[PDB]
Amino acid sequence: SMAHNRIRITGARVTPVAFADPPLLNTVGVHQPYALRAVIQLDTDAGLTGLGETYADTVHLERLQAAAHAIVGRSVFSTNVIRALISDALGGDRAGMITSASVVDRVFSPFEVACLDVQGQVTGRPVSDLLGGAVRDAVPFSAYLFYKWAAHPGAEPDGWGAALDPDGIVAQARRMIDEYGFSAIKLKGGVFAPEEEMAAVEALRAAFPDHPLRLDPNAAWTPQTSVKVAAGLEGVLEYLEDPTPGLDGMAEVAAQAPMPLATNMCVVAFDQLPAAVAKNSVQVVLSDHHYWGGLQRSRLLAGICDTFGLGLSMHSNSHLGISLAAMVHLAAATPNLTYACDTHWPWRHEDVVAPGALNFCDGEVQVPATPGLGVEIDEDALAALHEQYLRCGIRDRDDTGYMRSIDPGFNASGPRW
Amino acid sequence: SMAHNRIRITGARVTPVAFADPPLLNTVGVHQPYALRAVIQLDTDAGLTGLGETYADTVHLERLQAAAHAIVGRSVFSTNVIRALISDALGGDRAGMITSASVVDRVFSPFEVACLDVQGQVTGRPVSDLLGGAVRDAVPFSAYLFYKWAAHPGAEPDGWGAALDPDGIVAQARRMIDEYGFSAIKLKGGVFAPEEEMAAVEALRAAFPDHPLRLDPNAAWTPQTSVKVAAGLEGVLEYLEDPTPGLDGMAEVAAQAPMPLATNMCVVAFDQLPAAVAKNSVQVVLSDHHYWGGLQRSRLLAGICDTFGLGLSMHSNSHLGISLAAMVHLAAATPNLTYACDTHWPWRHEDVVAPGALNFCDGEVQVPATPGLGVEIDEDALAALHEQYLRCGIRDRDDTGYMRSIDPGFNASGPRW
Ligand SMILES: [Cl-]
Ligand SMILES: [Cl-]
């Protein structure tokens, strides 16, 4: 029942939340005990509210407020206009660099997802129907393995236990795969010497002979080291992700690697694709709607990759059920997204949405068929995680700073090997 | 009122039509007295019918029937799936070459447009709202000028008169621009010697000092000739379109031309973009939803161009009101489509849709705000143009064959100069 056949934005509520995260290691530090996210509730003059989810660093929250103010009074179907208004509001210029356009896309993304959610709700269509329609019923995900301590310093150890060697990594895989059924496995490396990470990979291969395997050391290696690793893992990895820093280095490694190289670090914005393509630095690009500017722009990224002969996967950061629902609709509607998607899901145990719509079964999530994004806010859960945010005092993600608070001389050097 | 919240295709009616066309000249011949199109009426189990419009050559009609049969039983929101089914049905492989994928896109396009029309109708949204939303209220078009005979042989001369020199071309512009208000002007060249076409361009510039101007000889020139033309028209043309054949030749000319080069001939499919981009052959690509695979894929083309630093315009072939409505919604929703679009509109005087929704005023068409494509079939007009198709006996477009039926020794050689 829309006057003037118009459904437009009346305001947005941005709610920062914090949820428990284990001490997962990576090449620059260790995860803090709480990860942060911002929930966007986008309100309209039809009484329909759409959901989006993004980062929650201090500067980002400020940008999210400026954005929320700039788009009041806009149709939820006018997402092109909404991006431009956010660009004007941020005073933006509309490899691996966060350009002004990259900032605009990170700020626009959660509003775009919330807009599509409202679009789906008002039309009776699932979000995947707004993206060309689902091409598969369910979206497969990977088991995202990390070396980890047993506990945050001075806190109760979690149920995972530590993983600091091949045995520990294999036990982690077994527990994760029994609970979720993942049929592909990714190891976060750049933490131990390459030979020890190769050994974890070989051990996973022996324990799970049919699981595709990936390794991502976040550019912790020189090109010369990366080529040795790639030779040593020939026929073992589905792809090698960001072994070494920079497009030139990646191109050098790619020329010698028997498996494809993937990246999320060198290509995080549209303006970075032409150089990545010209240099042959990578064969697979990891999508991520959270920094590419929402779902429609992620579909554009997928079409560009297809056109230029690049494979397509999906990158993840610690996230909750709103992001998960958006990931699933996006992947369901993307013909060339055939790699299993990364997710941090197993690492959290809290959420802001009502349960039931995002069950994993055999490693995959069925795409919801209901109108909109397919999940709804649980206001009590949201208030609780907001309260947790206020009380835990963490205001920015800082893996390195947190590592230094424990080990003051720690450096986030790289490459390390 | 959709059972299972499902609206799916029950069948398609393909109706070939023919409408009067003047004897317009181009570098390969002269237009036949009737141009051909196929109207797609896409029927659904909700009783909503969507409209699409495409070519009507013999082989294309056959492909359109195979496509219509393959997609019965599919949701109009499942356009990704529908393209894949058409690809399977055609047994397809899913510069300027008509690859199997290009064939698939030409066949899919009118069904995709008809699907979006149904989507808009069922959701209450104009098609532009399905493409990210309009960013402008009206879409500007160009005056598409041609050298022409006074009449088809043995027929009544049309009201335009002949145009065979600069004076005739200027008089044609004046009549067209008084009727339609176009604020940009394009000349179809490759018909007379370049020096005479340069003179028509200079005469248009003198007669319309503020109108952007374009010239397109359909690759009738050598690179050396093209550079002379471009030097001689420095500061006069908004772009020079397809002056010379092949990506290498275009790149040679582009390096010396003071204005951007445009193309529709060298880049007509997604698989042709990487080489065009790598060679620097062009600065502007002409979109055309009729062969790029419908509106969503045209939005993808627009995003690829934006990403790789290419300007975006729009190409046209003789067409009716269904294509016109689709062109307008597409252009309204495309932020980087800022060149005036080409259209053959002034050259016909017949249509298959009810009048009123596509008025030109000051060179531009307001984007319809109604649900769907915004135009509807006039069944009497459609029957009449179908009857005209059957009776006129023309079954394929053949500018060269028709020129030879008048002048047997005629050759479609090129380049000519
Ligand atoms: Cl608006
Ligand atoms: Cl279907």
Side-chain angles (χ1 to χ4, degrees), chain A residues 2 5 7 75 77-81 123-125 129 131-135 270 273-274 277 296 299-300 303-304 307-308 333 335, chain B residues 2 5 75 77-81 123-125 129 131-135 270 273-274 277 296 299-300 303-304 307-308 333 335:
Chain A
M2 293 144 14
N5 196 29
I7 167 170
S75 176
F77 290 91
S78 293
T79 51
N80 288 334
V81 167
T123 59
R125 311 311 301 180
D129 272 355
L131 300 176
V135 304
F270 290 98
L273 288 163
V277 165
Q296 296 162 98
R299 301 276 299 103
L300 161 61
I304 292 176
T307 294
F308 285 79
Chain B
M2 293 144 14
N5 196 29
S75 176
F77 290 91
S78 293
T79 51
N80 288 334
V81 167
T123 59
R125 311 311 301 180
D129 272 355
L131 300 176
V135 304
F270 290 98
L273 288 163
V277 165
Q296 296 162 98
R299 301 276 299 103
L300 161 61
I304 292 176
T307 294
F308 285 79

Side-chain angles (χ1 to χ4, degrees), chain A residues 1-2 6-8 10 44-48 122:
Chain A
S1 205
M2 293 144 14
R6 178 169 174 78
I7 167 170
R8 59 86 170 190
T10 58
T44 67
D45 64 351
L48 302 172
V122 86

Side-chain angles (χ1 to χ4, degrees), chain B residues 201-221:
Chain B
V201 171
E202 319 255 31
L204 288 161
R205 165 54 73 240
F208 302 92
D210 294 323
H211 284 50
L213 301 175
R214 313 158 180 174
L215 174 64
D216 168 20
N218 287 111
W221 307 329

Side-chain angles (χ1 to χ4, degrees), chain B residues 73-134:
Chain B
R74 303 293 168 170
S75 176
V76 294
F77 290 91
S78 293
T79 51
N80 288 334
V81 167
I82 285 165
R83 188 186 184 276
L85 293 174
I86 291 179
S87 187
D88 292 348
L90 296 181
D93 281 15
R94 229 156 107 177
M97 195 181 49
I98 191 152
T99 48
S100 197
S102 201
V103 170
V104 173
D105 285 331
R106 289 151 217 263
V107 180
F108 170 59
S109 172
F111 298 102
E112 192 259 11
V113 170
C115 281
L116 294 170
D117 184 14
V118 182
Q119 288 181 30
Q121 283 175 60
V122 86
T123 59
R125 311 311 301 180
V127 165
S128 65
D129 272 355
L130 307 177
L131 300 176

